[PDB]
Curated annotation (Swiss-Prot):
Gene Ontology molecular function: any one: L-ascorbic acid binding
Quaternary state and interactors: Monomer.
Protein name: Isopenicillin N synthase
EC primary class: oxidoreductase
A biological process term (GO) from this entry: penicillin biosynthetic process
Chief localisation class: cytoplasm
């Protein structure tokens, strides 16, 4: 098994005003997006050691009582309003992974999309402040930190495609973004439950099967344990881990609006029996956001693809991924 070429891109110019320097970052984003589809963003300015420490404290101290109280509908029939946001329980002896998902902190009972009961909008659920002091403050702060990084990355993607730098970012707004953070624990277990390991066609033992992401882009921080593979024409290649950088890739909405010029890379998660964290931020736009598809290969950029509202895309895509790869 060979190793993927995943470049490290200093994204710090994307926060500045040196336009030539932004263009040089954009070129590197374009090159990586047309190759394996992944790159590491470095010099990003986020305190990832505090991110990992506070996430670890939460996963290790939450009790079965609290997990039931936070559980999404798939694990708790009482919580009909929690499809996305809440706790995704492990099943001892059967399912190893457990996770906690939260959405835009601005989604409150007073928010108009919540009042309208619009699909894919939910109010976050949180543990008791006295049992997890400072956790909600940290998690909401983190949402806006990675929102900021993601805004800057979207400027790079726009310039890479020959668009003005706000082409995507204008649709990525704090008041309505459907972006989510998932705090995922992959545990060390001895014996490891065989029901939690899948075998791929090529014999590789997996924790999560091949998929494309449901996102515009995905902005991922992982601890320093190698696990991801990306599909190429010549087979799957290992993505090296780096627990100081953010791993970036496009989701299938980008592939749609660029007529597959920037593909959504197919990737999968190898089984590794090690305690590790996986903290993705899925960059989603607003429910009514529509970007006219274009084709950068054509002089006039003309595309025959239909515009797709981000809300409809997200609703269909989340259901599809559960049905293909299972309830997480
Ligand atoms: C990361 N995998 C994942 O995060 C997998 C595949 S990208 N993602 C999902 O299941 C989609 C979660 C979407 C989230 N609940 C939401 O409502 O926005 C891993 O390490 O397994
Ligand atoms: Fe993924």
């Amino acid at each position: 098994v060979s190793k993927a070429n995943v470049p490290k891109i200093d994204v710090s110019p994307l926060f500045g005003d040196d336009q030539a320097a932004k263009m040089r970052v954009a070129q590197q984003i374009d090159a990586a997006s047309r190759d394996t589809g992944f790159f590491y963003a470095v010099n990003h300015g986020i305190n990832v050691q505090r991110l990992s420490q506070k996430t670890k404290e939460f996963h290790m101290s939450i009790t079965p009582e609290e997990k039931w109280d936070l559980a999404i509908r798939a694990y708790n029939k009482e919580h009909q309003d929690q499809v996305r946001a809440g706790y995704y329980l492990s099943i001892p002896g059967k399912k190893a992974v457990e996770s906690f998902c939260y959405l835009n902190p601005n989604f409150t009972p007073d928010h108009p999309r919540i009042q309208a009961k619009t699909p894919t909008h939910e109010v976050n659920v949180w543990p008791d402040e006295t049992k997890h002091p400072g956790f909600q403050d940290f998690a909401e702060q983190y949402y806006w930190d990675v929102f900021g990084l993601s805004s800057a990355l979207l400027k790079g993607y726009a310039l890479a495609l020959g668009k003005e730098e706000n082409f995507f970012a204008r649709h990525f707004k704090p008041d309505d973004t459907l972006a989510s953070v998932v705090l995922i624990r992959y545990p060390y277990l001895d014996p490891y439950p065989e029901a939690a390991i899948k075998t791929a066609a090529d014999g590789t033992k997996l924790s999560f099967e091949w998929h494309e992401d449901v996102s515009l882009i995905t902005v991922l921080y992982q601890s320093n344990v190698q696990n991801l593979q990306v599909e190429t024409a010549a087979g799957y290649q290992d993505i090296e881990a780096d627990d100081t950088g953010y791993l970036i890739n496009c989701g299938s909405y980008m592939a749609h609006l660029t007529n597959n010029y920037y593909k959504a890379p197919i990737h999968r998660v190898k089984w590794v029996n090690a305690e590790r964290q996986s903290l993705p931020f899925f960059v989603n736009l607003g429910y009514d956001s529509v970007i006219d598809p274009f084709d950068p290969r054509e002089p006039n950029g003309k595309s025959d693809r239909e515009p797709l509202s981000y809300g409809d895309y997200l609703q269909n895509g989340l259901v599809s991924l559960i049905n293909k790869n299972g309830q997480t």
